[PDB]
Amino acid sequence: RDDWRCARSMHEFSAKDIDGHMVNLDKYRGFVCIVTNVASQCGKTEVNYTQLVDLHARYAECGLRILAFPCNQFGKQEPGSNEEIKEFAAGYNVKFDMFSKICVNGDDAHPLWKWMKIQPKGKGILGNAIKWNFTKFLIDKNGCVVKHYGPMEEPLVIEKDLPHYF
Numbered sequence: 001r002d003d004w005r006c007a008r009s010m011h012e013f014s015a016k017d018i019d020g021h022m023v024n025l026d027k028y029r030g031f032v033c034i035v036t037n038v039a040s041q042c043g044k045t046e047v048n049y050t051q052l053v054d055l056h057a058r059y060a061e062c063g064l065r066i067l068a069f070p071c072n073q074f075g076k077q078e079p080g081s082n083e084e085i086k087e088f089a090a091g092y093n094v095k096f097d098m099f100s101k102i103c104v105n106g107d108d109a110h111p112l113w114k115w116m117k118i119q120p121k122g123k124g125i126l127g128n129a130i131k132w133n134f135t136k137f138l139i140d141k142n143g144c145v146v147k148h149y150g151p152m153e154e155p156l157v158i159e160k161d162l163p164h165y166f
């Protein structure tokens with residue numbers, strides 16, 4: 001639709017988790033979140049999953065949460081079913097939140113992703129297009145986008161930004 005344009009927080013959105021159940025993202029109010037588009041057959045799948053698991057293990061007790069959205073739009077590198085992707089993520093000992101596969105670009109992009117991309121200046125992205133697998137957004141406790149990190153930036157580079165938002 002168009003109402004996503006008017007939102008001011010991630011917490012105004014909902015999304016289906018990887019089991020198919022709708023999740024209201026306002027449950028993340030009060031938590032610092034990394035939101036990322038993931039893929040199982042990407043050249044950087046291992047480094048992204050393992051470092052995201054490591055960050056979550058290290059900072060969940062501080063309030064860090066991670067929202068992973070599978071997306072097949074980049075080299076068709078997430079071709080499997082939601083059940084297969086859940087089983088894949090389990091292989092990296094993922095304990096953060098897996099969502100159902102979505103689009104992140106184009107007219108059928110999930111509204112949360114349409115919204116994140118238009119956030120200002122250094123928060124949202126340039127060109128209204130996610131470029132590849134494993135773009136990361138840092139979301140503060142109020143659900144606002146505070147930083148983004150591109151497909152080639154390892155998740156551990158986010159660690160230096162976390163203390164300003166916990």
Ligand SMILES: *CC(=O)N(c1ccc(OC)c(Cl)c1)[C@H](C(=O)NCCc1ccccc1)c1cccs1
Pocket residue numbers: 059061062063162163164165166
């Ligand atoms: C979990 C947590 O939030 N930590 C922390 C506090 C404040 C900030 O920045 C505002 C950040 Cl990034 C993290 C832990 C932490 O507090 N570790 C110390 C453990 C402890 C031991 C005894 C009593 C109380 C706390 C941090 C993780 C890395 C650096 S600080």
